[PDB]
Enzyme design. Structure first.
Site, mmCIF file in Angstrom:
data_model
loop_
_atom_site.group_PDB
_atom_site.id
_atom_site.type_symbol
_atom_site.label_atom_id
_atom_site.label_comp_id
_atom_site.label_asym_id
_atom_site.label_seq_id
_atom_site.Cartn_x
_atom_site.Cartn_y
_atom_site.Cartn_z
ATOM 1 N N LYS B 165 -23.466 25.050 37.833
ATOM 2 C CA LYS B 165 -24.088 24.728 36.991
ATOM 3 C C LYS B 165 -25.874 25.754 36.865
ATOM 4 O O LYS B 165 -26.311 24.483 38.052
ATOM 5 C CB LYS B 165 -24.536 23.705 35.497
ATOM 6 C CG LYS B 165 -23.357 23.276 34.642
ATOM 7 C CD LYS B 165 -21.967 24.498 34.602
ATOM 8 C CE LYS B 165 -20.881 23.639 33.521
ATOM 9 N NZ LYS B 165 -20.148 24.811 33.130
ATOM 10 N N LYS B 191 -16.414 23.555 41.751
ATOM 11 C CA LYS B 191 -16.002 24.733 41.788
ATOM 12 C C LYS B 191 -16.830 25.746 41.028
ATOM 13 O O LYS B 191 -17.597 25.085 40.229
ATOM 14 C CB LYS B 191 -14.633 24.311 40.629
ATOM 15 C CG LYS B 191 -15.416 23.669 38.654
ATOM 16 C CD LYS B 191 -14.275 23.733 38.214
ATOM 17 C CE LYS B 191 -13.127 24.644 37.625
ATOM 18 N NZ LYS B 191 -13.781 25.345 36.927
ATOM 19 N N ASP B 193 -17.642 27.836 38.309
ATOM 20 C CA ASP B 193 -17.431 28.020 36.866
ATOM 21 C C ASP B 193 -16.448 29.377 36.834
ATOM 22 O O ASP B 193 -15.927 30.340 37.229
ATOM 23 C CB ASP B 193 -18.470 28.726 36.096
ATOM 24 C CG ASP B 193 -18.595 27.602 34.721
ATOM 25 O OD1 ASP B 193 -17.720 27.318 34.123
ATOM 26 O OD2 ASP B 193 -19.892 27.308 34.595
ATOM 27 N N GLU B 194 -15.604 29.034 35.914
ATOM 28 C CA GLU B 194 -14.572 29.852 34.872
ATOM 29 C C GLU B 194 -14.641 31.945 35.081
ATOM 30 O O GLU B 194 -13.999 32.480 35.871
ATOM 31 C CB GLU B 194 -13.931 29.758 34.158
ATOM 32 C CG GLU B 194 -14.255 30.300 32.125
ATOM 33 C CD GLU B 194 -15.357 28.815 32.104
ATOM 34 O OE1 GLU B 194 -15.060 27.956 32.545
ATOM 35 O OE2 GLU B 194 -16.784 29.907 31.977
ATOM 36 N N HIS B 284 -7.073 27.303 35.602
ATOM 37 C CA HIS B 284 -8.253 27.079 34.695
ATOM 38 C C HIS B 284 -7.791 27.408 33.009
ATOM 39 O O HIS B 284 -6.943 29.053 33.912
ATOM 40 C CB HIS B 284 -9.453 28.028 35.075
ATOM 41 C CG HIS B 284 -10.407 27.568 33.738
ATOM 42 N ND1 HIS B 284 -10.556 27.823 32.474
ATOM 43 C CD2 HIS B 284 -11.225 26.565 33.391
ATOM 44 C CE1 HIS B 284 -11.984 27.722 31.200
ATOM 45 N NE2 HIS B 284 -12.695 26.739 32.557
ATOM 46 N N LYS B 324 -16.389 16.905 24.840
ATOM 47 C CA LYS B 324 -16.438 18.389 23.699
ATOM 48 C C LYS B 324 -14.707 19.431 23.705
ATOM 49 O O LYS B 324 -15.814 20.186 22.161
ATOM 50 C CB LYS B 324 -16.961 19.341 24.792
ATOM 51 C CG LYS B 324 -17.495 20.173 25.577
ATOM 52 C CD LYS B 324 -18.190 20.821 26.287
ATOM 53 C CE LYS B 324 -18.171 21.545 27.598
ATOM 54 N NZ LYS B 324 -19.128 21.622 28.517
HETATM 55 O O1 LIG Z 1 -16.967 25.634 31.460
HETATM 56 C C1 LIG Z 1 -17.214 24.381 31.341
HETATM 57 O O2 LIG Z 1 -17.337 24.560 30.050
HETATM 58 C C2 LIG Z 1 -15.779 23.829 32.248
HETATM 59 O O3 LIG Z 1 -16.756 24.445 33.638
HETATM 60 C C3 LIG Z 1 -17.250 21.750 31.781
HETATM 61 O O4 LIG Z 1 -18.814 21.769 32.332
HETATM 62 P P1 LIG Z 1 -19.000 20.221 31.988
HETATM 63 O O5 LIG Z 1 -18.068 20.174 33.079
HETATM 64 O O6 LIG Z 1 -20.562 20.484 32.627
HETATM 65 O O7 LIG Z 1 -18.608 20.331 30.536
HETATM 66 C C4 LIG Z 1 -14.963 23.988 32.213
HETATM 67 O O8 LIG Z 1 -14.835 25.207 32.187
HETATM 68 C C5 LIG Z 1 -14.763 23.629 31.057
HETATM 69 O O9 LIG Z 1 -13.650 22.133 31.290
HETATM 70 C C6 LIG Z 1 -13.135 24.265 30.348
HETATM 71 O O10 LIG Z 1 -12.270 23.972 29.473
HETATM 72 P P2 LIG Z 1 -10.814 22.861 29.280
HETATM 73 O O11 LIG Z 1 -11.067 21.823 30.568
HETATM 74 O O12 LIG Z 1 -11.536 22.025 28.043
HETATM 75 O O13 LIG Z 1 -9.813 23.783 29.427
HETATM 76 MG MG LIG Z 2 -16.220 25.885 33.280
#
Ligand SMILES: O=C(O)[C@@](O)(COP(=O)(O)O)[C@H](O)[C@H](O)COP(=O)(O)O
Ligand SMILES: [Mg+2]
Lengths: 126, 465, 126, 126
Positions: B165, B191, B193-194, B284, B324
């Protein structure tokens, strides 16, 4: 002609070619951090992890360019975001060096607008 | 059998409710909402026709082939309890309709055009029965759960990850700094972020190199194998492959791909590359909730998960249930089984419309991520068991003492829950007690417990069975 | 803020972040093996072979991905196929540790349906 | 079940799994050399050069297959071409081992028709 010794003459980047910084000189550098609004941070490393090295390149193909081990050191706590008090920085130098008296310890500062370290120098050598 | 030009009802060819499905047929369960005045039989038949062999008027070329052999067949329609204009229409598709090894082709038939028909108001694909004979045409996941644990040498507990982050805006060197500090405190993985691909604030190859330094530093420091999912998601397949190659040449263990926003064609190629080069592939599911959120229209996530298992991925995000992002418990337990297991019996109480036989295709590791913290640990271990990766991005980089202490807090919490479970403790009842006890012992965990003690995510569920 | 030490802080996977396992806690893990029908096994390594390392990658092209030395340890006897007695497992822990008192020793268990190790933790440090 | 130790258990190819060769047993092997008309030779190595190793592969591309350092040892004098007397072979064994008392020493024999070493075993361990 004086000969520059190659033996036991390792350096630690900025300010390594000057006389060892007095406490007054270190305090002046901390004042410069605070005057420019930069973010103080301490980093430390045991002797075995303090010097640039190449051992992870055993796992590589031909991609070692500008890869070195031991550029990263370990963060002392967190960067001192919001700190504008030089005495707080000096107190953390004391605490870090107390906790790790045998470690190399460096004081650095970050600029979040350039997003880069903008100063740094060694404050403890084992 | 003469050619007669003109329009006739689809149900005359494509509604066959006494059809006995073949064990090689692909089956689909569609939640269908017809327009007023369109009988369910005709709506189901239109879905079957326009996802297989038929169009809107009779064509003479049918007579050159055998429509009996090739046609999709609506073979059963059941009304939905609680709904006066929703039906489950079941369609069977001969195996000959599909390109071997192509999720792209399977989706192009089954979901290509039928969702836009004027004659229906809404359509949702709830499930697909992928027969063993079609499963066997796919390479599938590069490695799968057992092989991944064996390569990492990691057994007996959930794996722990963490998204770095701020999502965007960090430099490559700060990325590596953050990664090193996370990994060294006890996380197995971090990882990208996507949406971290390659951008002005951080170009991908710079990140890959600094992350490599961080992985190897944390691994040497801790003595545990470490990884960071380096994102190969890219604008073009050539750029995706360049990124995978760089990971290979750095010797690092794992990359990631955004399978829906990159797409199935690129995903399948990347999975094959990962199989051939020994890279773990984290998937992802970015964009899935565009498709899968609403009960009346779209494609349920369980189908998107089957599709990923086929196209290939060693990990796939599964939701958290308690975090969340949405994911109801029973729904989630059902598709976790569909992701991991070899053979999953029909169970409508978990949204499993068809018995699914994976015929030894490797299982995909579910990844629980998003808005979770230390107090959720017992629930996560209870829901998923050991074969999951639990990821704490904010829950690590939001620890008051920084990433290493944040990592240690999560690792302690996981290990304490795992030990308690193994000792006979019921994590559904005693989870808070387990965490409270570990908080008192570990100063790093105590700091996390205090900051996030009152934080819960409890909302009305949209994607209900 | 407390700082997580980078010095002399190596870990051994599952349960390394908890207090050292007492004998009762070890026995409880053995009971979990037996309750679930898993196959107990002991493995051990001298200190030089106990930690993941990379030295064989000197012989490789660009194929080091998920190759590490020292993931395999040495098997103590054989996996205890058919063992449903926790006291037999505990006796073997004693026997292994008596034979190799300077070795790292771990207790693992295998599931033959998943065909994977399904639990494991260190029971002996040199 | 007895457990085969992995610690300090390095071997030396032919006859290492038997009890240490007695003087009579060594003499019998020298007779076999002479009876078959093979060419006796002694080779020796300091401890650091005695066991197979991989260091030179740092200089390689992907061509390490069946390349190892330390397969060659150092020749004692020359192969004993024309020797048909076991006394002379046993005499050199003594000579080699006296000159290099800290070295590993092996007795080998060559067949010049197959052009290959046809026997060999360790005759001295530091
Ligand atoms: O971008 C985000 O929000 C995260 O990096 C989580 O961050 P935090 O750990 O800070 O919450 C993940 O990519 C989400 O979990 C994706 O959603 P899902 O797993 O439902 O596909
Ligand atoms: Mg993410």
């Amino acid at each position: 002609m004086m000969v520059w010794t190659p033996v036991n003459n390792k350096m630690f980047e900025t300010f390594s070619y000057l006389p060892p910084l007095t406490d007054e000189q270190i305090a002046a550098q901390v004042d410069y951090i605070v005057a420019n609004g930069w973010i103080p941070c301490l980093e430390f490393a045991e002797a075995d992890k303090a010097y640039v090295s190449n051992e992870s390149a055993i796992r590589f193909g031909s991609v070692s360019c500008l890869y070195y081990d031991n550029r990263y050191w370990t963060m002392w706590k967190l960067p001192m975001f919001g700190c504008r008090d030089p005495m707080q920085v000096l107190r953390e130098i004391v605490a870090c060096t107390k906790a790790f008296p045998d470690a190399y310890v460096r004081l650095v500062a970050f600029d979040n607008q350039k997003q880069v370290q903008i100063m740094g120098f060694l404050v403890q050598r084992p | 059998a003469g050619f007669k030009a003109g329009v006739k009802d689809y149900r005359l060819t494509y509604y066959t409710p006494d059809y006995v499905v073949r064990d090689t047929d692909i089956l689909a369960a569609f939640r269908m909402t017809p327009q007023p005045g369109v009988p369910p039989e005709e709506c189901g038949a239109a879905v079957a026709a326009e996802s297989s062999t038929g169009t809107w008027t009779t064509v003479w070329t049918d007579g050159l082939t055998s429509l009996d052999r090739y046609k999709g067949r609506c073979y059963d329609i059941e009304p939905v309890p609680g709904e006066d204009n929703q039906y489950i229409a079941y369609v069977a598709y001969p195996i000959d309709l599909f390109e071997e090894g192509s999720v792209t082709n399977m989706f192009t038939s089954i979901v290509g055009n039928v969702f836009g028909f004027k004659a229906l108001r809404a359509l949702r694909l709830e499930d697909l029965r992928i027969p063993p004979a079609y499963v066997k045409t796919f390479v599938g996941p590069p490695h799968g759960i057992q092989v991944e644990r064996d390569k990492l040498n990691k057994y007996g507990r959930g794996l722990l990850g963490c998204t770095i982050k701020p999502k965007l805006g960090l430099s490559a060197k700060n990325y590596g700094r953050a990664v090193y500090e996370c990994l060294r405190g006890g996380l197995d993985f971090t990882k990208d972020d996507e949406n971290v691909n390659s951008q002005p604030f951080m170009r991908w190859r710079d990140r890959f190199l600094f992350v490599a330094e961080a992985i190897y530093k944390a691994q040497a420091e801790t003595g545990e194998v470490k990884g960071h999912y380096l994102n190969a998601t890219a604008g073009t397949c050539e750029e995706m492959m360049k990124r995978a190659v760089c990971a290979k040449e750095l010797g690092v263990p794992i990359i990631m791909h955004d399978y829906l926003t990159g797409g199935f064609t690129a995903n399948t190629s990347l999975a094959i590359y990962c199989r051939d080069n020994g890279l773990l592939l984290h998937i992802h599911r970015a964009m899935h909730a565009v498709i899968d959120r609403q009960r009346n229209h779209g494609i349920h996530f369980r189908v998107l998960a089957k599709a990923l298992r086929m196209s290939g991925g060693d990990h796939l995000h599964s939701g958290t249930v308690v975090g969340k992002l949405e994911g109801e418990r029973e729904v989630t337990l059902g598709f976790v089984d569909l992701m991991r297991d070899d053979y999953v019996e029909k169970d409508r109480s978990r949204g499993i419309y068809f018995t699914q036989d994976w015929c030894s295709m490797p299982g995909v590791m579910p990844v629980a991520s998003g808005g979770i913290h230390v107090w959720h640990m017992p629930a996560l271990v209870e829901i998923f068991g050991d074969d999951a990766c639990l990821q704490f991005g904010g829950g690590t980089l939001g620890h008051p003492w920084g990433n290493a202490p944040g990592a240690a807090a999560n690792r302690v919490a996981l290990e304490a829950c795992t030990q308690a479970r193994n000792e006979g403790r019921d994590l559904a009842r005693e989870g808070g007690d387990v965490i409270r006890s570990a908080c008192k012992w570990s100063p790093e965990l105590a700091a996390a417990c205090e900051v996030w003690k009152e934080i819960k995510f409890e909302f009305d569920t949209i994607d209900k069975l």
